[PDB]
Amino acid sequence: ASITSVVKTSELILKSPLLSKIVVPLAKTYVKFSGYRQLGFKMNDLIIEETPNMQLALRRLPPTESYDRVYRLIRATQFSLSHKLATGNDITKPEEDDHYLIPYILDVEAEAFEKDALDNLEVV
Amino acid sequence: MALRKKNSLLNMANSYVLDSPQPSNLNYFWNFGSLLALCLVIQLATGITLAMHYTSHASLAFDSVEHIMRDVNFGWFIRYAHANTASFFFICIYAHMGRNIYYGSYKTPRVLPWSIGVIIFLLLIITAFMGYVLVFGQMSLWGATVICNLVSAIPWLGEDIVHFLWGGFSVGNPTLQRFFALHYLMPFVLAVFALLHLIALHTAGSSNPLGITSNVDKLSMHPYYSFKDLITVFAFLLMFTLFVFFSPDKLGHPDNYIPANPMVTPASIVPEWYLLPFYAILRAIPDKLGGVIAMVAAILILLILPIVDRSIIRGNAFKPISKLLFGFFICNFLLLGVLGQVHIEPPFIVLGQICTIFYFSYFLILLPMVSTIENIFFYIGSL
Amino acid sequence: ATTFYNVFVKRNSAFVATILASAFVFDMTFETAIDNFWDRINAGKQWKDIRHKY
Amino acid sequence: GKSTYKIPDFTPYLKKDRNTDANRLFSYFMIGSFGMLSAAGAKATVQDFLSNMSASADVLA
Amino acid sequence: YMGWWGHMGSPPQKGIAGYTISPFAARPFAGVVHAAIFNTFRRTKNQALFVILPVSFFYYVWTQASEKNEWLYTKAGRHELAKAL
Amino acid sequence: KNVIIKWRGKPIFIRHRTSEEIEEANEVNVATLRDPQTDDERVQKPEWLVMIGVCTHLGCVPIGEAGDFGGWFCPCHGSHYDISGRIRRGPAPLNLEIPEYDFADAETLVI
Amino acid sequence: PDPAIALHEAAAEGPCHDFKHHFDECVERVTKAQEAEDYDHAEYKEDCVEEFFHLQHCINDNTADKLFRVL
Amino acid sequence: MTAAEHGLHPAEYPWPQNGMLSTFDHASLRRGYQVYKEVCAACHSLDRIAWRNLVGVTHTTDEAKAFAEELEYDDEPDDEGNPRKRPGKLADYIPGPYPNEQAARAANQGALPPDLSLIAKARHGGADYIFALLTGYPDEPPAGVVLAPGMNYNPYFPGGGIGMARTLFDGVVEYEDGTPATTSQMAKDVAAFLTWAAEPEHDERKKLGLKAIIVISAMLGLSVYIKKFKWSPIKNRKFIYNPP
Ligand code: HEC
Ligand code: HEM
Ligand code: HEM
Ligand SMILES: CCCCCCCCCCCCO[C@@H]1O[C@H](CO)[C@@H](O[C@H]2O[C@H](CO)[C@@H](O)[C@H](O)[C@H]2O)[C@H](O)[C@H]1O
Ligand SMILES: CCCCCCCCCCCCO[C@@H]1O[C@H](CO)[C@@H](O[C@H]2O[C@H](CO)[C@@H](O)[C@H](O)[C@H]2O)[C@H](O)[C@H]1O
Ligand code: FES
Structure with missing residues (x-):
């Protein structure tokens, strides 16, 4: 699935009061049990990156965000191989779990999808 | 420049076993690939040796296997090693495939190694089936009869194809001699495909248990994974030793010590344990052709995992719902195995049909739904 | 310890020679030890134990 | 947390006698034993296995 | 890739200092107990439900099926067997 | 009596059916038969039931005289064949195949 | 004489007495039912194999080790 | 399936050879050969066993040569191409009671007594099944059982009706070692002997297995030490990050 799809569907849910009332609490528990924060990751660090679109989005990250992402991946790799969890300031707090990459990938995909549409235009 | 890098032959070995850059956090489930290579080497060594003493003619086959057990120096060991390693080969291949499914090894950019992997699995099944016939005991004959008759279901030409496979009108001498030649060949084909899936993998490298890139943090294959592979090699050899020396016939069927008799049918004809889940799937569909299609589809459906998994994240480490669904899928696969060897009696008939539906619905319904919902929970839950 | 290291370990040629010689010794002694232990735990049962009657 | 000249704490792992010959010799004793059992195991394996090619009992009879 | x-193929790395010590300088079994x-207790406790729930369910299903099948092929189960076929 | 002749590795069941056996077989309404056939379609001579004694389900050999329709019972998955060797109960789809057989003499048939 | 004879008798009278009585009662029923006329033209003819199996399984559990000890 | 259709499951008897480190009792093997020879061999062959196989297991070279030399075997034709017989040699296989299946079935009311060389591996239960079957003929079949003609009731045999009658009775054999030949004793000895016939490598195999277990376990322990030794720099790695 594309990030665009995921973001649009999520926005439909967040709009509907009923839907948000039942989905948002579930999503928060899901994230707590997921446990990626206990390896010091942010949610966006987990997104598959071996695609042209994602490689382009990663290249457009500001240098500081890019250097920090590299460190979180290396740190999480070291927790994984040691069979340990983060402690203290290495644990990602909910307020630090920012969607740093989502705006870049949504722009890359917007152009990619517009290009696909425009490749199929028919002069009326 | 070091010779290992400069010389083109050495550099090929170097690229796969020495300088090969690996993730630094592979867990012990990344050791099944080297155990599978070990099983393949044991099967080649023991198999070629048994070929030096075995006679493929139906009048002599079963007795040549007794001669191996009784007269050939260490023949009992070579025979039991070959027979038990065939089971260990399937335990390791199920573990390796389960690792691949849990950790999302089938996702881009690893679709090609996974797809060639599905063919390796089919070749292993065929190799093992033909080798089991070579003993020419009761299970050998009757298993060949039942399984080869499934080809009769192919419309129009099925009957003709069966007679062509048998080289006659029933399983007999021509079939045994051709199964010997093909059983000798198929492991070499299987080794080529095993090499192909590794070459295909080498473009992306190994995935890792976190599902993220390892390009940030690589370790040489040697010495780290060489020495970590030795631990599981010795654990494997301990299990091998316990079966081969202390319980060599635990995994077998006693009826295969009775010489093949085309007249008398044994009490129950079942395949070897590792084929049992596919046999249960076949029983679930009442139609002959339906059942054969379902049974083949149960393997070929693995080819669609790259499509039906809609997750933006690779692997299950951080996906609690996917982990539960995977647990149920695996246990259902084991229950199908058990149902493959029960009698066709109530209430196992209906249970086998429900388990078959669950097997297919994992690929077609549940994994696409669960992976869609989890995408949304990750996004909303972390806002 | 330095002496032992210097003679048997420092040169790989010497280390491999020591390992192979030890493997030779181990193989011969282990064979004899297992044979005796096997004979003690299975005493009175083996052909060698009843052979004298015949 | 900031200075890179302050080496992180390795005291939980560091051996005091790390530069001694006794220290190295112990680790090579483990490696050597492992090499020795692997040599003895390979020899046994090869000898028993290849003996299948020598005259079988029915031939010697 | x-x-x-x-x-x-890493993004540029900067600002990370990495440190480690020789295998000869370290105790390989430090903190093993x-x-x-x-550590094993923590890791096992956190994964226990994902194994227990499916295993226990499928074992229960099997147990019920195997007990029913056994009962149907007794004298007592004659009538229920006749209906089932 | 029912004989078992090996013919191309398959068993051949040859039963020398009595008068009353033939009668028993000619009773069953053709309507209620997975594979609807009457004995006259099966045998070319009412006193010689000649069949390929491989069960039509998977390919085990039915034990004769046993069954529930007192003809042949496949022990493998419990399929019951008749005195015509027609399938009555169990997983088997078809009646036991009839080989191509010709009575050269009245005392010998070729299969 | 055969040690088994004594061991089996002892196990039937002792730890396997409930099963012994079940088998006995079954036999009584079946023999009486066979005695009655138009038994040959009955749909269901009861046997005592099940009860026999329960008894023998029980005797074997209480005897196997004891028997091999005296051979 | 009914329990009767399966057959009653035999008890687990404590055989001497049960036990990772246990051989057969060779005195029992020798006695079991004598039961085979004097009782079973009337109907059952042992075609996979040669006289040489007994030597150094149950008998000396001389005893086994004596057994072989008492029999006549087909020789190569003489110079006019006429058939000849010769005395047996150690290389010869133990000869069976019947020339073919048809003769075997004719002598046993249609039933064919199987060859016993692999019977301990060819039946679930092995020695326990052979012992249970031989000693498990009730005096009377359970009320209600209808045996087919020429069948005998035995609950261990699937379906209950076996074509072999009871053959072991107290004192049918006189053992040469003075052991009381009760039904139970003879069944135990012959079941041991047949287990040996099915798997004559048994004793050697389990001893080689003990050596393998010891070596492989030590190698497993050392491989753990070596892996941990080599991996410690990776496991112990620490980082200081100063964001640029
Ligand atoms: C005079 C005949 C006769 C003697 C004596 C005899 N048997 Fe048999 N045995 C048979 C026949 C006939 C069968 C086949 C029964 C059947 O399949 O219904 C048989 C079957 C067996 C079976 C296989 C039953 C099965 O599971 O298929 C074993 C084991 C056996 N015999 C062992 C022995 C041993 C051990 C002895 C004596 C110490 C013995 N027999 C003595 C005639 C004999
Ligand atoms: C992937 C590799 C292989 C697998 C999975 C495999 C599997 C099997 C199996 C299951 C059997 C039946 C074993 C028994 O119960 O006795 C068998 C028998 C046999 N295999 Fe293989 N085999 C493989 C490779 C080979 C090779 C390379 C040869 C070379 C000729 C070979 C030769 C034989 C022979 C001669 C037999 C019959 C003798 C016997 O049963 O032991 N096999 N094989
Ligand atoms: C003869 C059988 C096989 C051998 C010898 C073999 C060997 C290997 C090896 C050595 C690796 C790299 C190390 C590892 O991850 O374990 C590997 C990776 C892989 N294999 Fe196999 N394999 C075999 C069969 C299969 C099968 C049947 C499949 C799939 C159905 C498969 C799919 C894969 C995939 C997808 C990977 C990449 C996994 C990753 O590292 O993320 N293989 N295999
Ligand atoms: C697994 C058993 C060991 C035998 C090796 C397996 C045989 C398969 C090798 C033939 C396939 C060609 O293998 C291909 O070789 C080249 C160099 O050798 C590798 O190339 C890689 O390493 C070399 C240096 O080591 C670099 O020039 C290159 O940038 C890098 O991509 C490819 O990544 C690999 O895919
Ligand atoms: C490149 C490698 C060099 C050439 C390889 C040599 C090939 C053959 C070497 C000897 C093979 C036979 O050598 C022989 O092996 C067997 C074990 O297998 C030994 O036999 C020993 O153990 C076996 C079982 O393990 C017993 O049945 C036997 O009674 C006992 O003596 C002999 O003591 C030895 O003489
Ligand atoms: S094979 Fe004849 S009933 Fe299934």
Whole structure:
């Protein structure tokens, strides 16, 4: 699935009061049990990156965000191989779990999808 | 420049076993690939040796296997090693495939190694089936009869194809001699495909248990994974030793010590344990052709995992719902195995049909739904 | 310890020679030890134990 | 947390006698034993296995 | 998607200092007892439900099916067997 | 009596059916038969039931005289064949195949 | 004489007495039912194999080790 | 399936050879050969066993040569191409009671007594099944059982009706070692002997297995030490990050 799809569907849910009332609490528990924060990751660090679109989005990250992402991946790799969890300031707090990459990938995909549409235009 | 890098032959070995850059956090489930290579080497060594003493003619086959057990120096060991390693080969291949499914090894950019992997699995099944016939005991004959008759279901030409496979009108001498030649060949084909899936993998490298890139943090294959592979090699050899020396016939069927008799049918004809889940799937569909299609589809459906998994994240480490669904899928696969060897009696008939539906619905319904919902929970839950 | 290291370990040629010689010794002694232990735990049962009657 | 000249704490792992010959010799004793059992195991394996090619009992009879 | 040593395909790295000590300088089994007891307990406790729930369910299903099948093929189960076929 | 002749590795069941056996077989309404056939379609001579004694389900050999329709019972998955060797109960789809057989003499048939 | 004879008798009278009585009662029923006329033209003819199996399984559990000890 | 259709499952008897480190009792093997020879061999062959196989297991070279030399075997034709017989040699296989299946079935009311060389591996239960079957003929079949003609009731045999009658009775054999030949004793000895016939490598195999277990376990332990030794720099790695 594309990030665009995921973001649009999520926005439909967040709009509907009923839907948000039942989905948002579930999503928060899901994230707590997921446990990626206990390896010091942010949610966006987990997104598959071996695609042209994602490689382009990663290249457009500001240098500081890019250097920090590299460190979180290396740190999480070291927790994984040691069979340990983060402690203290290495644990990602909910307020630090920012969607740093989502705006870049949504722009890359917007152009990619517009290009696909425009490749199929028919002069009326 | 070091010779290992400069010389083109050495550099090929170097690229796969020495300088090969690996993730630094592979867990012990990344050791099944080297155990599978070990099983393949044991099967080649023991198999070629048994070929030096075995006679493929139906009048002599079963007795040549007794001669191996009784007269050939260490023949009992070579025979039991070959027979038990065939089971260990399937335990390791199920573990390796389960690792691949849990950790999302089938996702881009690893679709090609996974797809060639599905063919390796089919070749292993065929190799093992033909080798089991070579003993020419009761299970050998009757298993060949039942399984080869499934080809009769192919419309129009099925009957003709069966007679062509048998080289006659029933399983007999021509079939045994051709199964010997093909059983000798198929492991070499299987080794080529095993090499192909590794070459295909080498473009992306190994995935890792976190599902993220390892390009940030690589370790040489040697010495780290060489020495970590030795631990599981010795654990494997301990299990091998316990079966081969202390319980060599635990995994077998006693009826295969009775010489093949085309007249008398044994009490129950079942395949070897590792084929049992596919046999249960076949029983679930009442139609002959339906059942054969379902049974083949149960393997070929693995080819669609790259499509039906809609997750933006690779692997299950951080996906609690996917982990539960995977647990149920695996246990259902084991229950199908058990149902493959029960009698066709109530209430196992209906249970086998429900388990078959669950097997297919994992690929077609549940994994696409669960992976869609989890995408949304990750996004909303972390806002 | 330095002496032992210097003679048997420092040169790989010497280390491999020591390992192979030890493997030779181990193989011969282990064979004899297992044979005796096997004979003690299975005493009175083996052909060698009843052979004298015949 | 900031200075890179302050080496992180390795005291939980560091051996005091790390530069001694006794220290190295112990680790090579483990490696050597492992090499020795692997040599003895390979020899046994090869000898028993290849003996299948020598005259079988029915031939010697 | 993977290069080779010297050009692996990492985004640029800067600002990380990494430190480690020789295998000869370290105790390889440091903290083994704590790990073997407390670390294994933590790791197992956190995964236990994902194994227990499916295993226990499928074992229960099997147990019920196998007991019914056994009962149907007794004298007492004659009538229920006749209906089932 | 029912004989078992090996013919191309398959068993051949040859039963020398009595008068009353033939009668028993000619009773069953053709309507209620997975594979609807009457004995006259099966045998070319009412006193010689000649069949390929491989069960039509998977390919085990039915034990004769046993069954529930007192003809042949496949022990493998419990399929019951008749005195015509027609399938009555169990997983088997078809009646036991009839080989191509010709009575050269009245005392010998070729299969 | 055969040690088994004594061991089996002892196990039937002792730890396997409930099963012994079940088998006995079954036999009584079946023999009486066979005695009655138009038994040959009955749909269901009861046997005592099940009860026999329960008894023998029980005797074997209480005897196997004891028997091999005296051979 | 009914329990009767399966057959009653035999008890687990404590055989001497049960036990990772246990051989057969060779005195029992020798006695079991004598039961085979004097009782079973009337109907059952042992075609996979040669006289040489007994030597150094149950008998000396001389005893086994004596057994072989008492029999006549087909020789190569003489110079006019006429058939000849010769005395047996150690290389010869133990000869069976019947020339073919048809003769075997004719002598046993249609039933064919199987060859016993692999019977301990060819039946679930092995020695326990052979012992249970031989000693498990009730005096009377359970009320209600209808045996087919020429069948005998035995609950261990699937379906209950076996074509072999009870053959072991107290004192049918006189053992040469003075052991009381009760039904139970003879069944135990012959079941041991047949287990040996099915798997004559048994004793050697389990001893080689003990050596393998010891070596492989030590190698496993050392491989753990070596892996941990080599991996410690990776496991112990620490980082200081100063964001640029
Ligand atoms: C005079 C005949 C006769 C003697 C004596 C005899 N048997 Fe048999 N045995 C048979 C026949 C006939 C069968 C086949 C029964 C059947 O399949 O219904 C048989 C079957 C067996 C079976 C296989 C039953 C099965 O599971 O298929 C074993 C084991 C056996 N015999 C062992 C022995 C041993 C051990 C002895 C004596 C110490 C013995 N027999 C003595 C005639 C004999
Ligand atoms: C992937 C590799 C292989 C697998 C999975 C495999 C599997 C099997 C199996 C299951 C059997 C039946 C074993 C028994 O119960 O006795 C068998 C028998 C046999 N295999 Fe293989 N085999 C493989 C490779 C080979 C090779 C390379 C040869 C070379 C000729 C070979 C030769 C034989 C022979 C001669 C037999 C019959 C003798 C016997 O049963 O032991 N096999 N094989
Ligand atoms: C003869 C059988 C096989 C051998 C010898 C073999 C060997 C290997 C090896 C050595 C690796 C790299 C190390 C590892 O991850 O374990 C590997 C990776 C892989 N294999 Fe196999 N394999 C075999 C069969 C299969 C099968 C049947 C499949 C799939 C159905 C498969 C799919 C894969 C995939 C997808 C990977 C990449 C996994 C990753 O590293 O993320 N293989 N295999
Ligand atoms: C697994 C058993 C060991 C035998 C090796 C397996 C045989 C398969 C090798 C033939 C396939 C060709 O293998 C291919 O070789 C070249 C160099 O050798 C590798 O190339 C890699 O390493 C070399 C240096 O080591 C670099 O020039 C290159 O940038 C890098 O991509 C490819 O990544 C690999 O895919
Ligand atoms: C490149 C490698 C060099 C050439 C390889 C040599 C090939 C053959 C070497 C000897 C093979 C036979 O050598 C022989 O092996 C067997 C074990 O297998 C030994 O036999 C020993 O153990 C076996 C079982 O393990 C017993 O049945 C036997 O009674 C006992 O003596 C002999 O003591 C030895 O003489
Ligand atoms: S094979 Fe004849 S009933 Fe299934």
